[PDB]
Design an enzyme around this catalytic site. Structure first.
Site, PDB file in Angstrom:
ATOM      1  N   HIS A  74       8.021 -38.263   4.180  1.00 49.83           N
ATOM      2  CA  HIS A  74       7.155 -38.151   5.346  1.00 49.83           C
ATOM      3  C   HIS A  74       8.013 -38.097   6.609  1.00 49.83           C
ATOM      4  CE1 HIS A  74       7.215 -42.457   6.745  1.00 49.83           C
ATOM      5  NE2 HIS A  74       7.204 -42.767   5.448  1.00 49.83           N
ATOM      6  N   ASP A  76       6.774 -38.642   9.902  1.00 45.39           N
ATOM      7  CA  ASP A  76       6.331 -39.561  10.960  1.00 45.39           C
ATOM      8  C   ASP A  76       6.944 -40.968  10.771  1.00 45.39           C
ATOM      9  OD1 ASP A  76       4.535 -39.730   8.565  1.00 45.39           O
ATOM     10  OD2 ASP A  76       3.067 -40.835   9.794  1.00 45.39           O
ATOM     11  N   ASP A 107      12.912 -46.052   7.132  1.00 45.83           N
ATOM     12  CA  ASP A 107      11.584 -45.609   6.671  1.00 45.83           C
ATOM     13  C   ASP A 107      11.149 -44.345   7.449  1.00 45.83           C
ATOM     14  OD1 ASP A 107       8.985 -45.293   5.911  1.00 45.83           O
ATOM     15  OD2 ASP A 107       8.231 -47.150   6.800  1.00 45.83           O
ATOM     16  N   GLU A 141       1.932 -39.819   7.029  1.00 45.52           N
ATOM     17  CA  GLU A 141       1.923 -40.859   6.015  1.00 45.52           C
ATOM     18  C   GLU A 141       1.595 -42.220   6.575  1.00 45.52           C
ATOM     19  OE1 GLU A 141       4.227 -43.556   5.502  1.00 45.52           O
ATOM     20  OE2 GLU A 141       3.331 -44.111   3.557  1.00 45.52           O
ATOM     21  N   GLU A 142       2.067 -42.520   7.792  1.00 45.77           N
ATOM     22  CA  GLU A 142       1.969 -43.897   8.276  1.00 45.77           C
ATOM     23  C   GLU A 142       0.550 -44.264   8.686  1.00 45.77           C
ATOM     24  OE1 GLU A 142       4.169 -45.995   7.636  1.00 45.77           O
ATOM     25  OE2 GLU A 142       6.205 -45.332   8.060  1.00 45.77           O
ATOM     26  N   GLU A 169       9.648 -42.299  -1.152  1.00 49.32           N
ATOM     27  CA  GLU A 169      10.397 -43.463  -0.662  1.00 49.32           C
ATOM     28  C   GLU A 169      10.320 -44.711  -1.558  1.00 49.32           C
ATOM     29  OE1 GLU A 169       8.531 -44.961   3.092  1.00 49.32           O
ATOM     30  OE2 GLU A 169       6.739 -43.877   2.462  1.00 49.32           O
TER      31      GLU A 169
HETATM   32 ZN   LIG Z   1       7.503 -44.636   4.736  1.00 46.30          ZN
HETATM   33 ZN   LIG Z   2       6.235 -46.925   6.844  1.00 43.37          ZN
END
Ligand SMILES: [Zn+2]
Ligand SMILES: [Zn+2]
Lengths: 192, 88
Positions: A74, A76, A107, A141-142, A169
């Site tokens: 991802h 973002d 992340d 994603e977040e 991840e």
């Molecule tokens: Zn992530």
């Molecule tokens: Zn995250």
């Protein structure tokens, strides 16, 4: 300054402000498009929702009818309270002890650049594998992926990838070990 | 599971200690797994404090570089798993 070029690329991508709630996705897509052109990878942009482009970079295998390997991530990152940081979260400052500080350094922009640099090294060094590899870079994603990966998996462009296996991840581990999220058969959250 | 077998073999080749944990019902893999695609969650960060979503999120450059090396060994293994029933 003298620096490993993979680290330099990582720091470049850390400086692209894909921070929620209004990520600079246009700049991230442009970065992946230019990377695809430099690496000689095919590039497909799939706009699953207006303003939400999934970018797929493809390295075709020698047996393109086998199902593919998806290296997913991802683009973002979550917001910041920048007053609480030691260094600007979008500067990607690297200190003299080697630590790179950025929102996204764990992340998960590290993994995206790791996939790209691993592919670049293996491909430019003359390796070839039976299975196609697709790197998919998704927005959103977040906040739950509802305008990103959740839509992408219903798209004809996704079905056309003929995915056989995906990575995405994990999470940092403070010990010498690495964490790996394992799932088999039907995932536990549909069991139900 | 041929994919886990290939991933686990590379980690044994590289002397990496793995700690398998359950897969969260979140993230991109929630959706990929729900449509039937096998998957793992993995980021090659060890000796790293758990700082996702926190102030001063950071990664040491040598852990980052070793991570690129790990993917240079994972990719050939995963992309060379021979034809399976699921490929037909
Ligand atoms: Zn992530
Ligand atoms: Zn995250």
């Amino acid at each position: 300054e003298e620096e490993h070029p993979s680290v330099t690329l990582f720091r470049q991508y850390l400086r692209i402000r894909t921070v929620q709630p209004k990520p600079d996705y246009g700049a991230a897509v442009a970065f992946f498009e230019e990377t695809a052109r430099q690496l000689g990878l095919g590039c497909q942009k799939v706009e699953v929702a207006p303003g939400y482009v999934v970018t797929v970079l493809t390295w075709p295998g020698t047996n393109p009818t086998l199902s593919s390997i998806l290296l997913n991530s991802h683009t973002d990152v979550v917001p910041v309270f920048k007053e609480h940081w030691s260094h600007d979260p979008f500067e990607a400052f690297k200190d003299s002890e080697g630590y790179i500080y950025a929102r996204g350094a764990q992340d998960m922009k590290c993994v995206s650049i790791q996939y790209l640099e691993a592919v670049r090294r293996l491909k430019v060094e003359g390796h070839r594998f039976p299975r196609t590899i697709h790197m998919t870079f998704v927005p959103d994603e977040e906040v739950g992926g509802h305008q990103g990966m959740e839509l992408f998996v219903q798209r004809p462009e996704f079905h056309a990838l003929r995915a056989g296996f995906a990575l995405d991840e994990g999470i940092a581990n403070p010990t010498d070990a690495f964490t790996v999220f394992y799932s088999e058969r039907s995932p536990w959250w549909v069991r139900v | 599971n041929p994919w886990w077998a290939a991933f686990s073999r590379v980690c044994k080749d590289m002397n990496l200690t793995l700690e398998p944990e359950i897969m969260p019902a979140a993230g991109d893999n929630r959706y990929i797994r729900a449509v039937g695609v096998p998957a793992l969650g993995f980021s090659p960060m060890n000796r790293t404090p758990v700082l996702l979503h926190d102030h001063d999120e950071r990664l040491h450059e040598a852990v980052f570089l070793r991570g690129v090396d790990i993917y240079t060994r994972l990719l050939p293994a995963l992309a060379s798993v021979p034809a399976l029933p699921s490929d037909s």
